[PDB]
Design a binder for these strands. Structure first.
Ligand code: ZN
Ligand code: ZN
Ligand code: ZN
Lengths: 46, 85, 169, 153, 181, 60, 320, 49, 50
RNA sequence: ACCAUGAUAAGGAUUAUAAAUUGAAAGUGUUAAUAUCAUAAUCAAAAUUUAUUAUUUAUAUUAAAUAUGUAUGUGUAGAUAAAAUAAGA
């Protein structure tokens, strides 16, 4: 990665850019995260 | 067969910047030319990453899925790796 | 012409075993948990032999009075396996039976037929994925008390799987 | 047996999640593409350097999302659920209503599960819109029913 | 932990079927200077091939073909065309006077355990899965590779060639089971 | 035009060659695929229809 | 299967075994009728100057077979184990060949044999309208004709449930009805043959016409009354359910004895090897092939040699 | 909850864009370049089609 | 004796009778004229004995 | 998996005694050759995805040449709106 980052510039906002707020749940069909796997907000799946 | 809906996806002088490239120049570089998050390192980069000046300036490792480019030059800057092979 | 049925003069007694198709039964390979011999897989042969020594025996289902399954949990936290139990000498078993296990005279009398025979703790193949069949053949000291038959050779914990690899465990 | 091998059921259940991932971020990927590719000013309030810095901030926000489903719908919209026969959408080896292949559609017809009426294979069926202009005229009639009959506000 | 043998281990998987388990006894390569320091982990060699390399490997090919010709009369003869749906199943003229039907799998399945030092890309060339897929009938197939679910075809006394197919069904049944009417 | 075969009084297609997804004007007026037929396809097209109406452990 | 009494409803393993076999349904799916699709035609298996054997394989979803012996001289046909899901081709075959259906032979009275027997006598009896068809069977199968309705409930044959069997009707061996003096299509069946278990090579035969004799052989073990058919002039043995290709009949059904089946396999060792045995299921074989490569016959004589007094042979997975 | 087109999402576009600059620093967003800014390092980027 | 010559299946099946091989060749204009189909690869089945 | 499937070709017959109707058109029988792997103990061909000097058929590129002599296919396709050199021995 440290030799990858010279010709490929690094834009790392962090994990905060992947969690959309609670006001954007119904626009995103109930989700808040942008992970490649889906995430359920119930404790039974968790 | 439908028109240009195949799942499995050439030099030209007057159509150099308009063949197998983006429509507009004001549009930004694609996601493959930037680091998204914390990575452990990729074995290959994708072929739709546009060759920049820093590819030929630094020249650490160019890994195209294989293709290892050890010839840095200025004629490759401004177009992706699909036209480079 | 009347052809004769091909029979044999000397036939072993296990050839009279019944199959519903009169054929060879299916040999289903074991689970993926038995691939590497670890601490969870070491004492599953010790678990099953102590189960058969406490359950009902025979066609009349004679219940074994002494329960040898209560001594299973105190055997595995010591780290002594069923294969390690066969490597214990007579001097080391009296230390194990009196001090550690606290085996009584009637519970030692029922476990001793399993130790005097040196039964190999190799999980045999069955028609099911969950196998409760151990090879009850007598072991030899040349092959590590593994009975040396059907590929049970000197480190084989499970039939169809790899060796023990005692450098790890 | 039994109904399907479990490798095909795990394959189509990933396709259902790719539909569910498509429903998750089709709003957010569309709005972030539309502002970052717009060079006209967004508003009277935001102009000049406030527009150019906002388009650059929305571009790295678009690029930092690992796993953003930007795959189009027609790439894997040909997955069959009862059998593993893979067809291609657009040709006769796929039917769009019951969403099965040509091999599965015949066995549902030969099995008697679904209720379909057979027409002569050189006609246009019975709907007058299909007999009039073909597939494209019926393609416009559903648009007239779903959208264009409503005076939108 | 497998010890090298030349006797196939016959595992009877049912009536009229068994399993032939034998392994083809891998030999070490030549120790000349062109085989040394070969880049194996790269798989993308761009080193210039001198004609001295091609003449050395020509003599190694003649040495390897001379070794494989000694085992050639012990091989099988593919007599019917192989079918290929994952597995490869063909018919063989064995050097025992028998017609067998065996299957060849792509991945490794040993006689005692599945653990080995080969990949799937290796063993598909070792066990003849790449071989039997690409050859048609009339060619050789090795006996040293393992064969799975080999079934011997039944034999009659009189030759079935130049026999009339317009016989009735119950006398064609009596003719094929070696008890003619 | 009423003297054509595919006569519908609304313009079904706008006469613009190259009206693709890259233009942001198409993005603003397009219908999002929420609660469409694709949402019916994601939750109903299951290889076992009894795995969409209950759980197997709950029924057993 | 059986009657759901009080202890079968209060048993947890009855609810558990029905979950293992059939999944979440719990009810066994029956054995349905073969439709007009996926059905083959009637084949001519054997042609001889005395008789003609015409058959059809896999005529039921039990994978049973339907055969018919056609006499060349008398033009008289005889069905063996009349169970076809479509007995309309068989009526058209005897109508277009100028044949007269006189009797129906039945080896045993399981549901793989008499499921369409009332359909066979009605359809073929209607064609001779423009002497009725007899039934030849053994009275030891009386216990299986009482449970014909129970077998149709378990295998989903609801249309043949409420049908009185023609062999249950009043024959000449039964007392007659005393009807009011103020109708014999169902009151009396004069054409009915009851076969005796004392089967010999001398007098236990059926004169089929033009000098061919059908020696019926009593061979129980798969069923209480199991009558094979042996034609010694033509080397044809209709074993029924006794002997198939590389397997024998089941014993895991009621009134099926394993030691009776082994005695039934021993009473065919005097027949020649070219006797083409014609089973009720599957492919036909020869008796010489089964003496060499059948493990059920091999186990039957191996236990006999080592001294087993009660040799018990029989299948638990196979044909009904 | 709005449905259909993006024109019906007034608050959600407002809630997204304020959240977009809220987490993103300008130290990160300056490194993203366009296509013509990369093409200027070519010996000749511009010629008529 | 050849097992395909004395096999059980070859009594009622004519296909399981010939222990042969087949050679492939680029057919000439004479064969594509007399067979009415243009075969760029022709099939010659042969039985041989060395 | 070695069952007894099913496809090919060939010959037969019945009706029009009306100028009306948009519209005088529809139903029923026999022989040759070919062919027949489902009551049994497994596994990823193209289940299946992706990539490299290399194998094709197609895709378009793609040229000279009058000194003489010269260069004919089977097929592949679209909707379908001309017709008498062969003996009813
Ligand atoms: Zn052992
Ligand atoms: Zn029966
Ligand atoms: Zn039966």
């Amino acid at each position: 990665r440290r030799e990858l980052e010279k010709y490929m510039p690094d834009i790392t906002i962090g994990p905060k850019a992947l969690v959309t707020p609670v006001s954007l749940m119904n626009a995103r069909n109930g989700h808040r995260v942008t992970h490649d796997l889906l995430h359920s907000y119930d404790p039974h799946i968790g | 067969y439908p028109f240009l809906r195949r799942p499995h996806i050439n030099p030209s002088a007057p159509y150099f910047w308009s063949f197998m490239t983006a429509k507009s120049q004001m549009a930004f570089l694609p996601e493959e030319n930037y680091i998204t998050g914390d990575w452990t390192g990729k074995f290959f980069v994708s072929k739709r990453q546009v060759y920049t000046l820093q590819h030929a300036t630094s020249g650490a490792k160019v890994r195209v899925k294989i293709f290892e480019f050890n010839s840095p030059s200025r004629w490759n800057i401004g177009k992706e790796m699909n036209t480079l092979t | 012409k009347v052809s004769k049925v091909p029979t044999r003069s000397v036939i072993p007694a296990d050839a009279l075993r019944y199959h519903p198709r009169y054929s060879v039964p299916r040999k289903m390979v074991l689970s993926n948990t038995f691939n590497v011999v670890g601490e969870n897989n070491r004492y599953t042969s010790l678990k099953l032999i102590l189960e058969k020594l406490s359950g009902h025996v025979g066609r009349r289902q004679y219940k074994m009075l002494c329960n040898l399954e209560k001594h299973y949990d105190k055997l595995k936290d010591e780290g002594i396996d069923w294969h390690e139990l066969k490597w214990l000498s007579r001097e080391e078993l009296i230390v194990l039976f009196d001090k550690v296990l606290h085996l009584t005279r009637t519970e030692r009398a029922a476990l001793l037929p399993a130790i005097e025979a040196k039964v190999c703790g190799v999980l045999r193949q069955t028609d099911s994925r969950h196998s409760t069949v151990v090879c009850m053949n007598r072991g030899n000291a040349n092959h590590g008390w593994r009975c040396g038959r059907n590929g049970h050779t000197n480190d084989v914990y499970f039939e169809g799987k790899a060796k023990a690899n005692t450098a790890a465990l | 047996g039994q109904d399907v091998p479990k490798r095909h059921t795990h394959f189509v259940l990933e396709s259902r999640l790719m539909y569910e991932k498509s429903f998750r971020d089709c709003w957010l990927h569309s709005v972030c593409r539309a502002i970052s590719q717009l060079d006209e000013p967004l508003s009277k309030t935001v102009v000049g350097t406030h527009q150019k810095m906002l388009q650059r901030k929305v571009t790295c926000f678009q690029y930092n999302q690992y796993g953003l489903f930007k795959t189009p719908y027609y790439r894997l919209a040909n997955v069959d659920r009862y059998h593993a026969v893979q067809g291609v959408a657009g040709t006769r080896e796929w039917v769009p209503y019951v969403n099965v292949s040509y091999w599965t559609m015949n066995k549902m017809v030969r099995g008697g599960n679904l209720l379909v009426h057979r027409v002569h294979y050189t006609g246009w069926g019975t709907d007058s819109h299909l007999k009039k202009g073909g597939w494209e005229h019926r393609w416009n009639k559903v648009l007239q029913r779903n959208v264009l009959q409503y005076s939108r506000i | 932990g497998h010890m090298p043998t030349d006797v196939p281990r016959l595992v009877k998987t049912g009536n009229t079927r068994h399993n032939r388990l034998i392994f083809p006894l891998q030999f070490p390569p030549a120790t000349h200077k062109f085989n040394r320091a070969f880049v194996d982990a790269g798989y993308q060699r761009q080193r210039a091939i001198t004609p001295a390399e091609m003449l050395v490997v020509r003599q190694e090919v003649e040495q390897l073909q001379q070794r494989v010709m000694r085992a050639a009369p012990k091989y099988l003869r593919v007599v019917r065309d192989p079918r290929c749906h994952g597995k490869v199943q063909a018919d063989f003229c064995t050097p025992e006077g028998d017609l067998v039907s065996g299957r060849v799998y792509r991945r490794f399945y040993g006689d005692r355990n599945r653990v080995s030092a080969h990949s799937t890309m290796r063993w598909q060339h070792i066990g003849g899965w790449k071989l039997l897929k690409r050859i048609r009938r009339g060619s050789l197939f090795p006996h040293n590779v393992p064969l799975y679910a080999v079934t011997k075809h039944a034999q009659i006394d009189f030759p079935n060639t130049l026999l009339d197919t317009k016989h009735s069904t119950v006398e064609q049944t009596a003719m094929q089971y070696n008890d003619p009417m | 035009s009423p003297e054509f075969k595919t006569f519908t009084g609304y313009p079904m297609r706008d006469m613009r060659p190259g009206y693709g997804q890259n233009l942001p004007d198409y993005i603003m007026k397009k219908r999002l695929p929420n609660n469409t037929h694709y949402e019916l396809f994601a939750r109903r097209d299951i290889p076992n229809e009894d795995n969409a109406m209950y759980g197997k452990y709950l029924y057993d | 299967s059986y009657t759901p009494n009080l202890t079968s409803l209060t048993n947890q393993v009855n609810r558990s075994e029905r979950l293992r076999k059939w999944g979440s349904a719990g009810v066994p799916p029956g054995v349905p009728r073969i439709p007009r699709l996926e059905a083959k035609g009637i084949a001519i298996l054997h042609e001889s100057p005395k008789v003609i054997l015409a058959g059809r394989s896999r005529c039921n979803n039990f994978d049973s077979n339907q055969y018919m012996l056609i006499n060349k001289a008398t033009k008289r046909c005889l069905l063996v184990d009349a169970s076809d899901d479509w007995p309309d081709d068989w009526a058209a075959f005897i109508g277009a060949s100028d044949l007269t259906l006189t009797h129906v032979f039945l080896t045993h009275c399981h549901i793989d044999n008499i499921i369409n027997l009332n359909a066979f006598l009605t359809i073929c009896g209607s064609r001779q309208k423009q002497d009725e068809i007899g039934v030849m069977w053994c009275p030891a199968e009386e216990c299986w004709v009482q449970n014909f309705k129970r077998s149709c409930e378990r295998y989903g044959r609801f249309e043949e449930m409420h049908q009185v069997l023609p062999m249950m009707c009043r024959s000449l061996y039964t007392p007659q009805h005393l009807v009011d003096p103020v109708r014999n299509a169902r009151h009396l069946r004069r054409n009915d043959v009851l076969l005796s278990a004392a089967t010999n090579r001398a007098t236990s035969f059926i004169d089929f016409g033009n000098g061919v004799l059908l020696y019926y052989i009593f061979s129980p073990g798969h069923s209480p009354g199991h009558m094979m058919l042996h034609i010694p002039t033509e080397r044809i043995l209709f074993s029924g359910d006794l002997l198939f290709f590389n397997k024998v009949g089941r014993v895991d059904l009621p009134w099926a004895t394993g030691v009776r089946l082994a005695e039934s396999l021993r009473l065919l060792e005097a027949l020649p090897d070219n006797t083409v045995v014609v089973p009720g299921h599957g492919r036909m074989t020869t008796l010489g092939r089964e003496r060499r490569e059948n493990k059920a016959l091999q186990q039957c004589y191996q236990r006999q040699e080592i001294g087993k007094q009660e040799v018990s042979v029989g299948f638990n997975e196979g044909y009904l | 909850s709005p449905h259909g087109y993006i024109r019906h999402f007034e608050n959600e576009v407002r809630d997204l864009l304020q959240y977009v600059d809220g987490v993103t620093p300008w130290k990160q967003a300056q490194k993203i370049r366009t296509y013509w800014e990369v093409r200027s390092h070519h010996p000749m980027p511009q010629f008529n089609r | 004796r050849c097992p395909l010559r004395h096999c059980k299946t070859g009594v009622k099946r004519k296909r399981m009778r010939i222990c042969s091989t087949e050679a492939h060749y680029r057919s000439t204009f004479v064969e594509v004229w007399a067979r009415h189909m243009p075969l760029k690869v022709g099939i010659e089945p042969i039985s041989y004995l060395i």
